[PDB]
Design an enzyme around this catalytic site. Structure first.
Site, mmCIF file in Angstrom:
data_model
loop_
_atom_site.group_PDB
_atom_site.id
_atom_site.type_symbol
_atom_site.label_atom_id
_atom_site.label_comp_id
_atom_site.label_asym_id
_atom_site.label_seq_id
_atom_site.Cartn_x
_atom_site.Cartn_y
_atom_site.Cartn_z
ATOM 1 C CG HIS A 95 -10.401 2.492 -0.682
ATOM 2 N ND1 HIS A 95 -9.300 3.097 -0.571
ATOM 3 C CD2 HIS A 95 -11.087 3.061 -1.597
ATOM 4 C CE1 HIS A 95 -9.166 4.177 -1.293
ATOM 5 N NE2 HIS A 95 -10.425 3.964 -2.139
ATOM 6 C CB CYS A 96 -7.802 2.456 4.528
ATOM 7 S SG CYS A 96 -7.210 0.972 5.021
ATOM 8 C CB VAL A 97 -3.431 2.909 2.460
ATOM 9 C CG1 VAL A 97 -1.941 2.679 1.444
ATOM 10 C CG2 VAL A 97 -3.357 4.487 1.964
#
Ligand code: VO4
Length: 160
Positions: A95-97
């Protein structure tokens, strides 16, 4: 969250509540690759160390490899990422933002390496479940380089 290859590898954005993390666990996530930088996490969770503890509390094994937004992993980071994802193959979440750019780039890289897909094929495979995956010029150039060096990356990943 979304599965690119079901219960093997998927992607998500940054959770803002513990509820979202429980939903990951219910979906079968076992391991989490955390891509946002410290400052991005600390805005929603106070301290990076606390966020990671909440992941472990919920039974997930995390690895933090911070990539700047719009960016790509360094070569050392990428080796670490791919060893991590291939060490234990089931239940991997990245995941990232937003769950689109950085995440989409790592997932596409994974398909290029494990299945031998061409770059355009790998991007579209991720966009099936995540519209807009892989957002920037730097990310697309990275994918071309990985595809061109697939044999060399696999050799390094599977060494030791
Ligand atoms: O936080 V992301 O790389 O979807 O912009």
């Amino acid at each position: 969250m979304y599965w690119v290859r079901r219960k093997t590898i998927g992607g998500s954005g940054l959770p803002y509540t513990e509820n979202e993390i429980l939903e990951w666990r219910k979906e079968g996530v076992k391991r989490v690759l955390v891509l946002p930088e410290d400052w991005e996490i600390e805005e929603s969770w106070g301290d990076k160390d606390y966020y990671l503890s909440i992941l472990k509390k919920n039974g997930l094994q995390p690895l933090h490899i911070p990539i700047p937004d719009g960016g790509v992993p360094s070569d050392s980071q990428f080796l670490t990422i791919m060893k991590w994802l291939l060490s234990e193959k089931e239940g991997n979440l990245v995941h990232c933002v937003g769950g689109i750019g950085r995440t989409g780039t790592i997932l596409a890289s994974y398909l290029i390496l494990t299945e031998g897909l061409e770059v355009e094929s790998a991007i579209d495979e991720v966009r099936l479940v995540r519209p807009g995956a892989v957002q920037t010029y730097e990310q697309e150039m990275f994918l071309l380089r990985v595809e061109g060096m697939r044999k060399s990356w696999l050799k390094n990943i599977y060494s030791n």
